[PDB]
Design a protein around this ligand. Sequence first.
Ligand SMILES: COc1cc(-c2ccc(OC)nc2)c2oc(NS(=O)(=O)c3cc(Cl)ccc3Cl)nc2c1
Ligand SMILES: COc1cc(-c2ccc(OC)nc2)c2oc(NS(=O)(=O)c3cc(Cl)ccc3Cl)nc2c1
Ligand SMILES: COc1cc(-c2ccc(OC)nc2)c2oc(NS(=O)(=O)c3cc(Cl)ccc3Cl)nc2c1
Ligand SMILES: COc1cc(-c2ccc(OC)nc2)c2oc(NS(=O)(=O)c3cc(Cl)ccc3Cl)nc2c1
Lengths: 318, 318, 318, 318
Amino acid sequence: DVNTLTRFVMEEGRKARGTGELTQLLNSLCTAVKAISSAVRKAGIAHLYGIAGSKLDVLSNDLVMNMLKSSFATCVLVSEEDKHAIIVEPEKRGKYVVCFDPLDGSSNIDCLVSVGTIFGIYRKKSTDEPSEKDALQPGRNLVAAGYALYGSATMLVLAMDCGVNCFMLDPAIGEFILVDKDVKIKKKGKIYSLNEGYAKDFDPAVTEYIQRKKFPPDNSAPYGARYVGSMVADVHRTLVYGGIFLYPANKKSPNGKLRLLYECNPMAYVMEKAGGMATTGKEAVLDVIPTDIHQRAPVILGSPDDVLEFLKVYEKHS
Amino acid sequence: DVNTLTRFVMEEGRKARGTGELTQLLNSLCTAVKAISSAVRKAGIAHLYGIAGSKLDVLSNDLVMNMLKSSFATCVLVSEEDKHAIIVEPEKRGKYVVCFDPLDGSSNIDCLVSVGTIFGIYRKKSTDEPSEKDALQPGRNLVAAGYALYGSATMLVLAMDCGVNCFMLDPAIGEFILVDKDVKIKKKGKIYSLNEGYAKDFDPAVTEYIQRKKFPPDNSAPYGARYVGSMVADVHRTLVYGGIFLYPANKKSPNGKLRLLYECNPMAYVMEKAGGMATTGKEAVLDVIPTDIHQRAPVILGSPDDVLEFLKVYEKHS
Amino acid sequence: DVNTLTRFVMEEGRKARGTGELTQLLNSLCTAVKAISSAVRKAGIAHLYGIAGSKLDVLSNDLVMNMLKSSFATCVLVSEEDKHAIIVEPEKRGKYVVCFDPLDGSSNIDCLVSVGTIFGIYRKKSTDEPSEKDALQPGRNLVAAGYALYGSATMLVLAMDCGVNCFMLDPAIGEFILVDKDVKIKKKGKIYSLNEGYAKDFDPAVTEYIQRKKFPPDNSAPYGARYVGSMVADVHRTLVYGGIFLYPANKKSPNGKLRLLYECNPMAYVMEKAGGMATTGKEAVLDVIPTDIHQRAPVILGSPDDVLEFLKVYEKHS
Amino acid sequence: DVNTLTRFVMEEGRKARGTGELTQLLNSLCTAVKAISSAVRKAGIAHLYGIAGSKLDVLSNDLVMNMLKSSFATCVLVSEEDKHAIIVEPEKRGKYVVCFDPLDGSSNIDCLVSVGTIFGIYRKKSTDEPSEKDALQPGRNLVAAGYALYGSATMLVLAMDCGVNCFMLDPAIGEFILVDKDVKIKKKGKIYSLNEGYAKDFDPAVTEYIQRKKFPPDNSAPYGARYVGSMVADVHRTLVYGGIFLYPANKKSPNGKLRLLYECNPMAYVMEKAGGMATTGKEAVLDVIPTDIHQRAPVILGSPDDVLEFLKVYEKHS
Ligand SMILES: COc1cc(-c2ccc(OC)nc2)c2oc(NS(=O)(=O)c3cc(Cl)ccc3Cl)nc2c1
Ligand SMILES: COc1cc(-c2ccc(OC)nc2)c2oc(NS(=O)(=O)c3cc(Cl)ccc3Cl)nc2c1
Ligand SMILES: COc1cc(-c2ccc(OC)nc2)c2oc(NS(=O)(=O)c3cc(Cl)ccc3Cl)nc2c1
Ligand SMILES: COc1cc(-c2ccc(OC)nc2)c2oc(NS(=O)(=O)c3cc(Cl)ccc3Cl)nc2c1
């Protein structure tokens, strides 16, 4: 049969027999994502350019922020665009905390590079008056996670207890159509993605691991390399074709470059649910316990075999 | 004021007081790109997944192929998807030879990677019955050229005698708005783009040049690295952000992998018009004379300072 | 705050605490309407005219039909396009019966006149295997009714226990936006609607009533006249501006022309929910008991005052 | 083959070999209609309802007004929305005068009724400073005229010296696809269109005519009655299905309700270029010399045979 994000979600709801909040939460995220998408493809740019006579980062955040509060199922929201965690008014409070990057990669949206949105959904654990504390939970506590990629087409990838599901947006009818049910990442891929410009600053294990793909020790064929620069773009390619995505610590700080709460955990969750791995070299991303909401983390994720190899080598130099 | 692609071309047309063929030619190509873009963003994908009850490479090709023959401005079309050159029917012949790649990067559209259309437009030179011999001209003969980028937004870059112009597609009204008049490229960028997988097969000049970006001799900051794997994308970022794009010759062949007529020349011609550089290592891309319509050619292009720098290193190993 | 059909429907579900079926049903319904609208506005008409090189009544029905079956919330469906009731396969059965008119007004879609979709939702009462017998319920047993109007813009009017609501489709984000809460009709309007072509065949009661409009007895001001030809459009105009719509019996037969199950029952129901009136002249449309699923029925709906005037002039002739 | 509005016009302009102005005039107008159409189908209504967190007549006027000015082909512009005629700056002056109704039927856009843009293009005769005077020309002097219809689908009808042509707007690729070449209207139809709420004030000549439609003298079949209440729609129907449209003089004034400059003339011009007829009862609409740019005129247009019958009756009462 044919299936859509709303139908897929609704059903999962029924089976689950819950409160309905998550179904309502996820749905708002959905409307937001499309609204966002509408703007990213330059909806009515003509109007701004005087067709009638007379920032996208911020708008994206307002959409998401506003659609969630209206959901009535949120209490604490964190966004790569806000200094502190936004605390939802008493009248519209729910039981879920949402951590998200409204439009990741925006900085490079000038060259029409693929940009995306990332979201992670937790269930508030404590009974205290909401605060940012409710957002400092380990990726391992995620209820649902996913991202929307505004590429050649707009795709939304949702990961839940069941597994990962890929929906494509039919812009003609504003509907997310299921085009990939219960995904599973290749055991081993042949493409590695990482900014090799930071080479002079890599640790020796990352340096060796790279050498290992350029010049396979077992004289196998060398891996291919791709690096969009946009996390969602790169991570999604790694899910589809398999492979390995790296953004390890270096000179910036052994604390890594990507954010834990709304970039790392979310993807790790999706990766792990698809059957891959997502580590920091020292432990599992999802096992890492947040301290501050914009806290960074090193990330290595992709096909199981690849991540394990990296770790094999990481142990070597440890 | 506010201008569109059509209006833009129309005023240039009145200025030069020509026949109007090129104007029509460009318009057809324009509607062709709008068609392609609708397809790429998955317009009516729901009707393909049973909403009513019951390739993107060929679809795009048919679109360009049809559109152009309909304009009455062409006589010889050369496409990446077609083996031989299509010789237009005698009732729809014009005085223009068009070479193009309807959908580049098409081989990786699975991961929703950006894709683009590339096109070069020549003026049939001889008076002989139209044959593929008519597409065997050097890029320096180009009359107009450019590409379409189906990324986050849909942009069309048109390079002609006058300059390089960027037009954004307001999907809401299917119209191309000028957003960047007479574009020029930085003198020196800070990003290098090539596939570092083939490292085992890079020729030393390319190997050493890459070493210097990672470990700059003058201890300056190292360049950043990016590689989408789609020519339109990478080349467009190079134009917008400045920098250097590499696809040199090695083992595959002393000729590189990209094809001369519908990939290099157009891209090399846009660069040069934007005041940039495009070389094969031994000569300017626009100066190489074609032997066959599918002829391959090595390419290195981008900011002058960076292209010159590479050429300095290339010279060191010759 | 802002609200959409989906969010409005989900919170109604949460109030009522039910199985969730009717929610998926409306939702399934909502999707079909966006797709029908998409096609009605001629989505990709370019392609059928050869832009690439080489029915609406049917499609509308196919969509609705296929989306409803997929909801898992229906057991028997009735369409003005199918002669026998359709019994949903056992694997997709729900507890609801849906009688609808995919695209009413179609015949005249050649002139681009407005058109629409009418739908009525009944709950199954008996336990006998589903048959068209479960579709012969008086309009008075409707659980939910509604219609979509593909006019200058696309609107969806949903009527339920709680009353009437209007939603506008935002084509850019594929979302239905609530723009009129708990709609109530005027007590008295200034427009009468009917095809004055069948004048030579009007029964006296109707010929007198029309006189009363063109030459008001109390010498008040004459009512205006409007007849689109598309019921959905007429009735909607009536509901919004107030007045009286008439499609009474005559030579054709003391049954009128319109269908009771999927044309009159839904409008009449929406009307009585808006505080208006809808009679056949002998009784109330909703009180009429069906014998055949394609049974015709006389209709007069609109502002309470205007409708009562008819009934008074109707009694003067009985 | 396949053709677009822009291709059509460019081919007409190349044939004739004019100055090119008319060609830009047309495409500028085309662009406005696409924009209007977008706003009419409620492009981004979601935003104004707070999906982000925080007049259609006027806008339509600003789009046409600006696009025409920005064309460099006009000198005098008459609009229903402006009291005086707008005299184009001396820098953007062209040799054409354009009258138009930015969005006829807007007063009723509440019920979602069909609406449309009407336009007429006169060439400026004199060498005098452009003024309101230059728009005072007889329909007989039109150069191009047409109208956009925002019904169930958006179509633009263009009538010129060569004939009448209908273009269907394919909202997916943002282009107008020619779907009806050299249109011609039925010699006779079966639908009469007029507001019968004014029966009380009709003159006898018109009352008798309406009588012969309900009770045909040659006991033929009665004509159908259709009145949408929006000129563009009642006229487009007449043009597509044949029949006759009436808006004769009444109590309002022996001059009628419709405006001659931007409502009657255009319509009148299409009817005649399509075989039809347009009269004020006393003379061909296209032969009336205007005194004021907002001058009104009685109109009866449609199929020849139908209009002549009216004219036969009209004389019987003169
Ligand atoms: C189709 O509409 C419905 C009906 C029911 C529902 C729940 C209980 C019940 O009583 C037995 N009857 C209906 C729902 O419960 C829920 N619970 S929930 O928290 O939103 C949820 C959503 C998802 Cl993606 C996955 C798991 C869960 Cl846990 N959604 C529903 C949607
Ligand atoms: C309004 O659109 C017009 C009017 C005229 C045109 C040409 C001569 C003329 O004689 C007075 N009057 C008008 C055009 O000529 C041309 N010539 S052309 O070959 O297509 C052309 C297109 C471009 Cl991108 C740039 C230069 C030239 Cl060379 N396009 C026209 C478009
Ligand atoms: C998607 O959100 C939800 C949650 C619940 C639901 C029901 C019980 C419960 O236990 C606390 N928690 C949630 C629903 O029940 C229903 N019942 S229902 O039959 O579909 C329905 C839909 C509408 Cl338009 C109006 C009344 C009713 Cl009767 N829809 C739900 C949607
Ligand atoms: C799109 O390309 C072209 C080329 C030429 C054009 C004109 C003269 C010329 O000299 C040989 N070469 C080219 C045009 O002239 C015109 N003249 S015009 O006034 O705009 C016009 C437009 C239409 Cl709808 C119909 C008749 C006329 Cl009269 N449009 C052109 C468009």
